[PDB]
UniProtKB/Swiss-Prot annotation, chain B:
Phenotype when changing G1S: In strain: Omicron/BA.1, Omicron/BA.2.75, Omicron/XBB.1.5, Omicron/EG.5.1
Outcome of mutating L7Q: In strain: Omicron/BA.2.12.1
Effect of L7R: Increased resistance to neutralizing antibodies. Decreases HLA binding to NF9 epitope. Increased binding affinity to human ACE2
Portion of the parent chain present: 446 to 494 of 1273
Protein name: Spike protein S1
Subunit organization: Binds to host ACE2. RBD also interacts with the N-linked glycan on 'Asn-90' of ACE2. Cleavage of S generates a polybasic C-terminal sequence on S1 that binds to host Neuropilin-1 (NRP1) and Neuropilin-2 (NRP2) receptors. Interacts with host integrin alpha-5/beta-1 (ITGA5:ITGB1) and with ACE2 in complex with integrin alpha-5/beta-1 (ITGA5:ITGB1). May interact via cytoplasmic c-terminus with M protein. May interact (via N-terminus) with host bilirubin and biliverdin, thereby preventing antibody binding to the SARS-CoV-2 spike NTD via an allosteric mechanism.
Disulfide bond entries: C35-C43
Gene: S
Length: 49, 49
């Protein structure tokens, strides 16, 4: 992973993303979602990430 | 000093019927793994001050 002052930026567009497996992963110590609930991620979606 | 006597609900399994009352302070399982009455990951106290 790149350094903090040169944080790596990635564009996600035109693909399907399964957020359920990402949320259910226990390897993440901190997981904070603010805009929308993590459960309802797979229902509504925007144009890019 | 801050009033902590006022507690409001944030998490619930479903919605509330009109003129309904809920007082059960049960642990909420926010993930696939059941909490089994134990506070932890994907587990939150439904009441907040």
């Amino acid at each position: 992973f790149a350094s903090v002052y040169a944080w790596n930026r990635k564009r996600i567009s035109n693909c399907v993303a399964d957020y359920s497996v990402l949320y259910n992963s226990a390897s993440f110590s901190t997981f904070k979602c603010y805009g929308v609930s993590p459960t309802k991620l797979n229902d509504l979606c925007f144009t890019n990430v | 000093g801050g009033n902590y006597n006022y507690l409001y609900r944030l998490f619930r399994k479903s919605n509330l019927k009109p003129f309904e009352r809920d007082i059960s302070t049960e642990i909420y399982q926010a993930g696939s793994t059941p909490c089994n009455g134990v506070k932890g990951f994907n587990c939150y106290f439904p009441l907040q001050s």
